[PDB]
Design a protein around this ligand. Structure first.
Ligand code: FES
Ligand code: FES
Ligand code: FES
Ligand code: FES
Ligand code: FES
Ligand code: FES
Ligand code: FE2
Ligand code: FE2
Ligand code: FE2
Lengths: 388, 104, 388, 388, 110, 105
């Protein structure tokens, strides 16, 4: 495990989750957009703490661990693709096939007994909706749909987005996204006014605990997640008061959005409808290492033809990206960064003082602890260890 | 004032029972051996239900963060809990469990 | 504790002091000047490793821990004082009263059971002589006089000063200030020459070790400190020789200063008279974290009316501050910085080789060990821990 | 030990070497060139984690540990050499003799009982071939020849060089230098074409394991090292292939070089002949701290007279240094740096997957583990510890 | 070379010992004696260039002298990290108290 | 040549007794079982008084940093001490302990 055992013993309700500082292994993760990786142009990235290399050959994507088996250097320091189906380490020329990672040649010693008897780690890669997903796991991968929110893969759903590296552990990002009451930080977003949005300040919960969410563990595709139903029995808060006096009010716009929120393993949020009544937002918080994550944002809007796809793209570039993805979510970024210190020593998982709306987050923590496909560990990064 | 909770035999030793109260915060009735105690059910450190915690002797451990309370005094036994639990007087008469109306 | 137990076991004469890396809890500490904080303008700072917020409401100062009870973010990332007597967290709007830290409201859920059932940590704050003191401790505070050198609070004593952050543990600062032989570093100071001060290179000890210092175990107000008496029976050294040859001379000025030197818990030096015959210097070395401290300097002079105070204030700005506080003490700053490496691994507390004048330092280490009011620990910073 | 006991237990063939993270104590090490240290101008440097001061007095070099015995400050912060044969600490004026480190005076207290009783650590210093060597060890030093490669000290051998600090543990530098197959990284070096060199891409080994090297531990001078004889039975690679197709060719130049390679304790390589058939290269990888080393480069060429020494120097500045030392070796620098991560956690010493030519590196590891004169430890840096 | 290679007499090997078998034009083999039974694998560790015959045998598990990795001498399967590639196993038989090892490795099990 | 320290009975085995001399640095007398020993009182590593330390067998531990010396040989027993302690001749006669004016030659 990655956390002090004394702390894990304390969080009995979700120890696996608290231990998953590096994220969950054996799940699909988006890491870039298709148009960002070009033919024969190897790109480097770090996922779940592992340095990876991705390349496009004859249109298809291939993923190799960016670390020579020999002396452990990153092949990317000086890329040497001497043939189209292989890559040669710049150090002693050990050569591997992108297709299966097999060490097929060694230019410095053609007679070496290592030739054909070593294999560099490879990971499945798949492109869908213009997004590049890497299965950071072992063995045959499950269907991509299992690790994607409902409707993301619909035939007509046109996906557009933006991606960046954010300085906070991935879980802080996930929790902030699925946090019902964090809506308060968005009260002054330009999107609220500029898009006539109705947005309350928070919620006065209603009904019992079980009614606050809907745990999905029976989906046929196998996706595991949780729906935030705080608004089904709760009273929306539009007048914020201190000592009984109104000090702040919510937004009374006409457009009703974000009344269908759900978080799904390995860590992707679905906001529907948002940022407009005819759109959806799908965002991932991908673990890069213990301190950072990819904030993979996508906005989906059904389009029936190339004409509507072009129109949507133009609206996206001129409005949605700057007004919503940035104008609205930028506050989410520094919010995540603000929780770093409290959880950096792993003590925040014990000292946090939660309130009613956090029931949604607790549900997520439990689901994640029970249905994740594996805990990434530092040994996975350096090399698994085991003594007879 | 007193509220009939249940028959002493309705609870096995070392178990906990949550007592809901319409228009009021839930309560937790703990059975320590053949003795019964009662406190507020919600952990004073958050939203966890103590009735879903672990009872060790006369000390209840919260399921959320490992904080703990002495079910007899309501005083914190383990961090991060700091705010004392509300304790409710309890009496068993003729194998019947009764809990005081208000904390005391 | 805060230090390797193997080390603490070795320093039997002052283990608590060596363990007090983060400073002593339950003492008053000056952190800024009154003029630095205005009505309704919250100010942040870190003291003994704790992030704090100070505000002035209706002229009176209040101090709250700058850490929300909910998800542990600093309230100061985005200040929201929505009513004169409260501060609202920017994240989920938990609202606290400056007066007692009680969680009086939660805008995102006015029905939360947490309202009125949680309390943000508060610390006593007091203004005296234009200085802001914070009692970084628990329970009812003792009189401020207990933690201040004699005469600092005298009615006619006019106090003027300067404050800044220095990169060295607070203890290195304390020991340098109370170090009888450290005056060697001041041999070329502009103040010595420009103010005709007599300043030897050091002292040849006279009498017994017991006569070298005078410890004050109790006072009218419970003060705890040590007086440096090396000059009572010691021989001032004005000629520095190497192999019998004179290589350096002390300063033969006519002004005799610093004949009265004492260090007091929690860590404040009193030099009288200094830098001139009719003045006094009181300086604190306040722990900010294990690697930094506030070097809070003040110069005091009795003034009977507004006329003398005005004059003094003019002289302070035009001469004393630039010639003494900076021109003299600046050398103390890098001297403190020079000792950091040796004590950074806590091994200097074992390997140091002391000589006679260090009796003063030893006396302070024992006094501090025997009379401090508590050892600040990292647990105080993150949250006190203990298992039943 | 400097490394996890679990790892040392795993590397049974060279545990002392793996543990020698800070280098080997009790060996001579070059740190600068004679012309870089002037009469009466003390120079600082860190060797094996220790801060040292080197000074020239009457043309002779002396070395004192740059750490006052008193409060552990570096004397070099403010150098005070008040008499020709001494140095006085800027803090409390403890004075030491350069020749024996004895505390001979204390300006702040000429009557201290410490005078004449304490001694600052001194290290032997010797100049040879215009290079400054320091014996980082205890007791009378062995002949410098023991820690130098054959011919370096030859009377006619004119030595010229360059030195700099490189960001990698010294061992990664040594192994990269003695690595038979790393020659691949130099395939595009300007020196190759510009100096018409013959340079293969690697070697197909031939013969038994023992024939791959010549271990030297029967050297009358005490020298301990290993010769790389991979070329005696191996077939050099000049046509690199992948899938049978040639993708790279070695250099078919006329000048034969680097056929006589040897590595010697404490960590100095001898390349002969190189960069020209009439020259030799001697380079040290000196430990500064666990993450850095001095890359001390020297090129040697017999010179019968001043006229030749001058012409040699001219071609050195105009050709050898820029085209070889830099033009050829610069690639070795980032190669060393490239191996830092894999070995930083000490796990690389277990997970590395070696091949045939690494037999030379294995031989070196064993030779170094068996014949080093001591393992430098952090305790040597802070102050030896024992309850014996 | 040939089907069965004569190694030595079963009596020339004490239980728990290892013997390296060098072959003309081929990689060396290592023969292990576990009690009164014999097994064989390639002598070179699959993780590097170490000779397993120079390692330590514990029961039916051979530990490599280089990095501590290990293998089961009967199956040739890795028993301890960092080893991950299986060893080739060569059948051994005793004909008239004489130990013989196969010249070709066994073909993949299950 | 000799200074009267105390009666051999005034010191329990395993105890230390400081001896303040006029015009000279203090000495320390240790009783290891039934035999007595003496050395300087000041630790060679600083300004601590070994008489305020802890005696374990024939080894005295300094209260300042944990350094130690063998009270018989005056040789360093534990780091950080490195400088030998001066040893002074002790003599018991007629049930009384005496210490030599100067340290042993
Ligand atoms: S490090 Fe890649 S071939 Fe050697
Ligand atoms: S909610 Fe009970 S210990 Fe935190
Ligand atoms: S972190 Fe302050 S209200 Fe939630
Ligand atoms: S630190 Fe050098 S003389 Fe005090
Ligand atoms: S060579 Fe055998 S474990 Fe590495
Ligand atoms: S003064 Fe005695 S060990 Fe340091
Ligand atoms: Fe948000
Ligand atoms: Fe000073
Ligand atoms: Fe090289």
């Amino acid at each position: 495990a990655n956390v002090d055992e004394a702390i894990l013993k304390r969080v009995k309700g979700w120890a696996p989750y608290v231990d998953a500082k590096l994220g969950f292994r054996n799940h699909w993760y988006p890491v870039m957009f298709s148009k960002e990786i070009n033919e024969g142009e190897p790109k480097t990235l770090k996922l779940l703490g592992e340095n990876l290399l991705v390349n496009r050959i004859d249109g298809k994507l291939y993923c190799l661990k960016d670390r020579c088996l020999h002396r452990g250097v990153q092949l990317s320091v000086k890329v040497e693709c001497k043939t189209k189906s292989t890559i040669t380490c710049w150090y002693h020329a050990w050569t591997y096939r992108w297709e299966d990672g097999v060490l097929c040649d060694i230019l410095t010693n053609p007679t070496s007994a290592q030739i054909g008897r070593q294999k560099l780690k490879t990971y499945p890669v798949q492109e869908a909706k213009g997004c590049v997903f890497i299965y950071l796991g072992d063995g045959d991968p499950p269907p991509l749909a299992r690790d994607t929110p409902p409707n993301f893969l619909d035939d007509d759903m046109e996906i557009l987005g933006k991606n960046q590296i954010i300085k906070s552990n991935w879980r802080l990002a996930v929790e902030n996204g699925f946090d019902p009451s964090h809506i308060y930080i968005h009260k002054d977003s330009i999107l609220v006014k500029d898009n006539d949005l109705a947005l309350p300040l928070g919620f006065a919960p209603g009904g019992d605990r079980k009614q606050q969410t809907r745990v999905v563990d029976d989906d046929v595709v196998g996706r595991k997640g949780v729906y935030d139903l705080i608004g089904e029995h709760g009273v929306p808060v539009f007048e914020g008061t201190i000592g009984g006096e109104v000090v702040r009010e919510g937004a009374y716009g006409e457009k009703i959005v974000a009344n269908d929120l759900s978080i799904w393993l390995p860590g992707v949020l679905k906001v529907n409808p948002f940022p407009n009544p005819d759109m959806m937002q799908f965002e991932w918080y991908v673990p890069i290492d213990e301190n950072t994550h990819y904030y993979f944002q996508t906005l989906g809007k059904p389009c029936a033809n190339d004409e509507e796809r072009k129109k949507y793209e133009q609206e996206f570039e001129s409005k949605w990206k700057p007004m919503a993805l940035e104008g609205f979510n930028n506050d989410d970024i520094w919010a995540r960064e603000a929780m770093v210190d409290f959880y950096a020593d792993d003590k925040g998982w014990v000292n946090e003082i939660l309130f009613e709306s956090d029931e949604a987050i607790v549900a997520w923590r439990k689901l994640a602890s029970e249905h994740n496909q594996g805990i990434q560990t530092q040994a996975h990064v350096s090399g698994l260890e085991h003594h007879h | 004032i007193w509220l009939k909770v249940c028959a002493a035999s309705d609870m096995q030793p070392g178990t906990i029972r949550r007592v809901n109260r319409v228009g009021a915060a839930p309560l937790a009735v703990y059975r320590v051996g053949d003795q019964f105690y009662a406190t507020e059910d919600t952990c004073t450190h958050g939203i966890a239900s103590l009735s879903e915690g672990t009872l060790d002797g006369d000390v209840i451990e919260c399921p959320f963060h490992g904080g703990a309370f002495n079910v007899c005094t309501g005083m914190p036994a383990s961090s991060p809990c700091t705010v004392p639990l509300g304790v409710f007087e309890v009496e068993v008469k003729e194998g019947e469990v009764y809990v005081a109306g208000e904390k005391k």
